[PDB]
Amino acid sequence: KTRKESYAIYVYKVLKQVHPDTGISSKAMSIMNSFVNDVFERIAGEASRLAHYNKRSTITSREIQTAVRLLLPGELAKHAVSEGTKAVTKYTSAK
Amino acid sequence: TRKESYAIYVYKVLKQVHPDTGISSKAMSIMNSFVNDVFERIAGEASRLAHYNKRSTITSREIQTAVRLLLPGELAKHAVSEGTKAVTKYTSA
Amino acid sequence: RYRPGTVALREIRRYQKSTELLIRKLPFQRLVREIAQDFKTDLRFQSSAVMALQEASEAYLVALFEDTNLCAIHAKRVTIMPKDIQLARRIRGERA
Amino acid sequence: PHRYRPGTVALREIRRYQKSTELLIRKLPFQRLVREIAQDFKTDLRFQSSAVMALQEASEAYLVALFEDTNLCAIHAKRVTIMPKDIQLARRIRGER
Amino acid sequence: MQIFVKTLTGKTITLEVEPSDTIENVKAKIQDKEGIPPDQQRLIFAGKQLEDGRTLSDYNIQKESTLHLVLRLRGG
Amino acid sequence: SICPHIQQVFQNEKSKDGVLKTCNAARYILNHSVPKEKFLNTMKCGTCHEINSGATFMCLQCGFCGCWNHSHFLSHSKQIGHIFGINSNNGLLFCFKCEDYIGNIDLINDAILAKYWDDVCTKTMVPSMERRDGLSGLINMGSTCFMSSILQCLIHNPYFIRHSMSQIHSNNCKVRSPDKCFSCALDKIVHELYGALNTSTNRQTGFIYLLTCAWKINQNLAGYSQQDAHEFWQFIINQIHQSYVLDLPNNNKQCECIVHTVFEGSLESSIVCPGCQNNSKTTIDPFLDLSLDIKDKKKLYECLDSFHKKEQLKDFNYHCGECNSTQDAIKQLGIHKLPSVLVLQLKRFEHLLNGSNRKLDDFIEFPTYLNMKNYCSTKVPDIIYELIGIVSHKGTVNEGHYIAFCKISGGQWFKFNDSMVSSISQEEVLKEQAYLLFYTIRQVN
Amino acid sequence: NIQGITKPAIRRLARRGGVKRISGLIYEETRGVLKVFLENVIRDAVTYTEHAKRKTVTAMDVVYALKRQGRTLYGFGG
Amino acid sequence: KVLRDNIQGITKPAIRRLARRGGVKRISGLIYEETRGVLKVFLENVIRDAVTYTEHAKRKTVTAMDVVYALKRQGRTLYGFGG
Amino acid sequence: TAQLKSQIQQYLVESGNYELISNELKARLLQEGWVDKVKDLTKSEMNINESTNFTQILSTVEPKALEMVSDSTRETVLKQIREFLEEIV
Amino acid sequence: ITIDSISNGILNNLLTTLIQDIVARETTQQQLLKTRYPDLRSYYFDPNGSLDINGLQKQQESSQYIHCENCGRDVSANRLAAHLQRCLSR
Amino acid sequence: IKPKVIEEYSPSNDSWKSLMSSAKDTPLQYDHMNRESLKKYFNPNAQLIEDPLDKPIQYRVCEKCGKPLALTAIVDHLENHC
Amino acid sequence: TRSSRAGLQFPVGRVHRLLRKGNYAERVGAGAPVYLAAVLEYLTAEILELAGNAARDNKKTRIIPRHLQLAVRNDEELNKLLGRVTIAQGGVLPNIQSVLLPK
Amino acid sequence: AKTRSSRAGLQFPVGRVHRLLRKGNYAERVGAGAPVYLAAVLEYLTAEILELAGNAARDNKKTRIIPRHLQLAVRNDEELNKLLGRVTIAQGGVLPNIQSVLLPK
DNA sequence: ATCAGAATCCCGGTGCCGAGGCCGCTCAATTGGTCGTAGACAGCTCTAGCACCGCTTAAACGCACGTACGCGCTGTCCCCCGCGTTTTAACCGCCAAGGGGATTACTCCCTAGTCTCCAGGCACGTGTCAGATATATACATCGAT
DNA sequence: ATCGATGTATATATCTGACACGTGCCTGGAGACTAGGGAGTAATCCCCTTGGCGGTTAAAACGCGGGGGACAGCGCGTACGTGCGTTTAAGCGGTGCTAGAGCTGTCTACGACCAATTGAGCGGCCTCGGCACCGGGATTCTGAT
Ligand SMILES: [Zn+2]
Ligand SMILES: [Zn+2]
Ligand SMILES: [Zn+2]
Ligand SMILES: [Zn+2]
Ligand SMILES: [Zn+2]
Ligand SMILES: [Zn+2]
Ligand SMILES: [Zn+2]
Ligand SMILES: [Zn+2]
Known part of the structure; x- marks a missing residue:
């Protein structure tokens, strides 16, 4: 048997965190997984393009922030940047 | 400082095709940008194919199928024929 | 007996409320196999591939029909015409 | 006195502008407009002439394509004069919002 | 009239201000002498932060007053 | 027995x-x-x-x-x-x-x-055993680390406790709505921590109303984004003064609210020209807090001495009448009236040539008792303060976390985190990077 | 063959898009358009399968062919 | 120094010539506002993109490579400026 | 005589010196945390003795708190009251 | 008689007065604590700094959920600031 | 001793109840807070609490509303506010 | 682990491994995977919130692809982002032109 | 022949293409026949484009090539127009196209 | 305005299979440690973007006058829609059957790497004629008769 | 149909600045040899795909008729096309220089590699209740009168 990876557990945890009494089917789970993979590959491609344009072989949080600001509309990119900065703060507080 | 381009090669090709025709600098920059864009497109297609086939290397078959998928029928066929001829001439030497 | 136009709006509502596939699977699969016979022979096909092909074709046809309806409405008419489809495909950039 | 009929000068100017390839939009007003638009995102910015020329060329090409689509829509509408609704329909079919 | 503004290093400065002027005017006067962007500048007087669109005469600011220039410290 | x-x-x-x-x-x-x-x-x-x-x-x-x-x-x-x-x-x-x-x-x-x-x-x-002191944390609903720290010192503030438990606002409020007035929302919090709601998602309902009220005036300070803690302090204390004048039955510069009667002071400025030493025209300016720089200093007295240190004006157009000559006068700030609770702010940030900023991570010494006899304008007896609150920030100029330290009756200190309330020794809080200080009146000789 | 897409299917597809009245040549027009689109997509999928050194077209091949043409579709393990 | 009223710099004969190049025969009097709005939207988009690319580069001058990248990302690849 | 110590205490409050000597006594002790140290002693006494008897606790803390008063706090107040007693004697 | 002898008695009079003032206030406060609360226990002190006053660790977030009063939805703790920006703006 | 203290300054039978009339007109007096320094360096309307951290918060909880009420505000809440 | 240190739910290790094996650059920073995981978590949380709202509007407990399609098409920013994206079993919006309506 | 370009009988630098492929972070390992194939394809494309440009320039009786000639050559062909449908050429212009309905009778 | 007649939504009941929890499982993230260099930092050099003025001039603006077609209205022909009747193969469920896709172990060969050496292409400098510019001449073409 | 005139195509001198060519030198490309890990190939399993059969039933197909929709034709008056006087802002020649772009020397702290491990993540089972299906009644439009 092949031990393939997926994202069902994390999506289900997020759903139960935002909606305790709400289910989900397998088709919606596959759609969410495909959407997550697409957004991930888009952001990675943007980061690689910026790194190659700036002649740098390192991908830091600044490149990711600029990529998510360029790829997403104004308010959505601002909210994502605030969430990312909060996560970075929480990660840098402890170790 | 130094800066690489493809001016001399395009000039040689033009002289081998039209030996009595000049070229301006703007047309040279346009041709350079076009060549760079085509190279980037073909490299990206080859990388996507190698990652879909789970291969860590890239052979002539990947470039062949990439130019097949990128160019229309007659153009892709002529490009594949020229590439196969060049590969055969290089392997024979 | 109902007047012309009411059953049309009723069918429009019924088909906009539904989400199933209005085209049967077996003739579409036979047509797909007949088209694929030209490129290569002795080819197998999965059910999910045919389902995705049908979904994409239906979505594209729905979008083209919506664009044709918009063009026909702008043309001060009520009935669509092939010229509307041609203009839509020309403005879309797909047609040469 | 001599007087031309309407439509001749229009076709003559169409042919003249389709033969030549120079920039119909002048430099200084477009540059000032670009600088004013860029002032809102960040102040104290400097621009190269090549970037302004490229922006002008791109805007002119986009406007030419939009006018061609508007002319196609107006011809399909059994009319000759273009109207803002033609541009609206062209931008709707193009998917631009 | 002339008032006093306390900088970040403790040194006080003097700016020529008029009672009819708004806070947008003094935000430029501090900038041409220090270069600090006005969005990060916090002007505090009598424990009250100066808001945009209001003149100094509405905040009961008199001649030879003393302002406080401070910055922000975000956290969360 | x-x-x-x-x-x-x-x-x-x-x-x-x-x-x-x-x-x-x-x-x-x-x-x-x-x-x-x-x-x-x-x-x-x-x-x-x-x-x-x-x-x-x-x-x-x-x-x-x-x-x-x-x-x-x-x-x-x-x-x-x-x-x-x-x-x-x-x-x-x-x-x-x-x-x-x-x-x-x-x-x-x-x-x-x-x-x-x-x-x-x-x-x-009689109060319960577990709710005799109101020790309870506030669940962080996001980037609200700066919000909960400011409310913690006001919970154990003896002046705010007496004003809240006396029911002065509730007996004189016109709207009496917890989701509209700040004072009505603060009374729900002290009722939730010191009392018991009739009749773990507990002791947290009153904190939700504070976010709902603050969103109606300024959504930027709703805890969704990381903001400054000192800016949130002056924002909430000003709204309490605005709610008091609204509840008035019907001209006076000094207000009678809980803020103006406790934390309101007054400064004194003098522009001493070296001509005849008869300067100057005294100008009294009230204040609510004191901002002090900490550059090239190590003790709390050093930062306060620099505030009282005389400075010479080098860009001030002057025309004296005593000596009748344009001279560079000397500016000196003095303290006219001292408030009951003195709050001190430390500018832990510097400016650079490229416009960027750097946080000052230098430790500043501060004693538990502060004498203020050397900073009065107009001999003087001994006036002593007592430290009761310490707010500590850790991070950068645009990113960090807030942790407050407050002392209660009996000389016992505590670590007031977001959701972690724990005791701590007195010598440990004297070594942390203090951003805000709280000094109340203790004894005047 | 190509006559599998009958009149009622095209009428239902037009009713879904909001069409009230349909002409007589729209059927053949959509037939030709669908034929061209299916030819292109099947050519892409066949090229992908032949490069995959297999004889069975999978769903991933169709997903990649749709992503190439800017028609990314979700719900098929893409 | 702040700029103002530069949107009116696109005069009527400029749009007239732009329509003549596209093959328009007769033009109405209500096309100029729509053209100005569309041009302003496009310029705002490309300028936002260019300013973002320049801010990521930690520079204060906008070069041509940033404009080329911004046009390439929007599906408007332009040749004749390198890259 | 027994009326000698009453007269010095009588004039000391009349002259106003009695209040200031009490102010500086509490001032120096509070600036060094001496009040805090004696408060740590009493809470520890209730732990070892397990009793709330006032005379039992006071018999322990009162003789103990005498020596913890540093000589720096002592030599200053005695020097200052000598300036105050010799005003009449 | 000497001068230094009387000064010691004066200092001893003020010393016992302030000493008896502090202990008298501490004995009554403790007397009320155990009388009103016979089962009173002190707050737990953690020398490592990993437990609260009750001896428990910090609960994970957002393992808890808060019941909103505007819409009656059980929203998590961390998502509460994002939920209030949309239910209140209706 | 010098008679100067006896000239103009000047078991007993007095009682502490004799100062009842004098206690009904003087304002609130503190232990270690001088009244002369209040008007000289503090505000006249400034609230003052001598040693607030000596004892815990003295308050009671109602049976119906459960509001933490001060000792001086117990009777007022039970009449027209409970 | 590391996700608990940042208070997130998405795995940081898997994202870091995918960035390492993705051949996007030579070296990968430490703060980039946490930022990417936070952005992805916010996006999927928004999508799931909209899907739950659309399901509650239809009196259902399990989310169907129709609810996802409706939630995506009803929003403006999501429609602008997912413009060239199609959803299987999604459907179209119930839109009817004004001219086609009778008297 | 010392250079790999002369051994294959091409004009584009095989070594430069190999270096760009190895440094472009496109894959881990690189084959041997891919650079020659890519160089041959690029050479054929450039040869076709230069043929069209020379024809367009000879049609205008000019010695050198201007971007207008390149625009005309790309817009005249069908395969190159489909390949460069989203590509804009600076100083290229438009095609001399006039609708029949606008022409007078 | 009214009402008989279909279309459709909701309620109650009955039945069913996909999903959330569960148990066993195992392999890649975590921890402690070390070695290596891309990148941050400070310093110096240079260069073109910008305000400035001054002068010249083609294009933008406003105004008069004329005209032709977008819209409205009328009328006139006809072709998809609603309905009824006849046909039909899609789908459902079941049963056979095989061969290509997935998985494991073996060898093997080609290329990433390292050390060494040279000429192809880079900027830099310099000579040079193709075409823009301006003048004049012949002419295709358009408006009114 | 004819005639005038008006902008347009073409010949010719010529000046010049961008284009073509010589030259030096450096570093990236070419030669030669090696290790070692990714890839081709032999072998095996099974499940995933293809093929055939029985029925019956909603969908497909054909014909009637018809009335609303598509389309041809005339009125018109207003908004756009064309031309001319006015001037105003656009465009070329240099003018000074400095803040910012670009190259270089230097130190280090953050990132890759590696050994153990174990627990968080994945494959398999299972029951049920949220959802699918069906019958019936009330509900809500719609067209003729
Ligand atoms: Zn007794
Ligand atoms: Zn209130
Ligand atoms: Zn007040
Ligand atoms: Zn003087
Ligand atoms: Zn709510
Ligand atoms: Zn006695
Ligand atoms: Zn008695
Ligand atoms: Zn009560």
């Missing part, structure tokens, strides 16, 4: 009412007695007449006073039989036959409401 000698007199009604009537008068005397006659009448013995010869006890039935060091008041009980004496130093009752004070009877402790004592035992109750 309970003192049986005071329980025997409790059996009679008139005898119990008589002793409860005189202590309320005795405590009223000590609160309104001139210090001159205080030692001559309340702290002078009857036998030796020595001043403060131990604990001086006043008699319960007559005007005899005896010292403690020579058993002069104890002999009054061994000869006449008055074993119940009130100490003039604190107003407590001491029993001679029990050799101990009476500190387990709420009747004598609340003898000022002895006329309605029958009602307090029925309709009121």
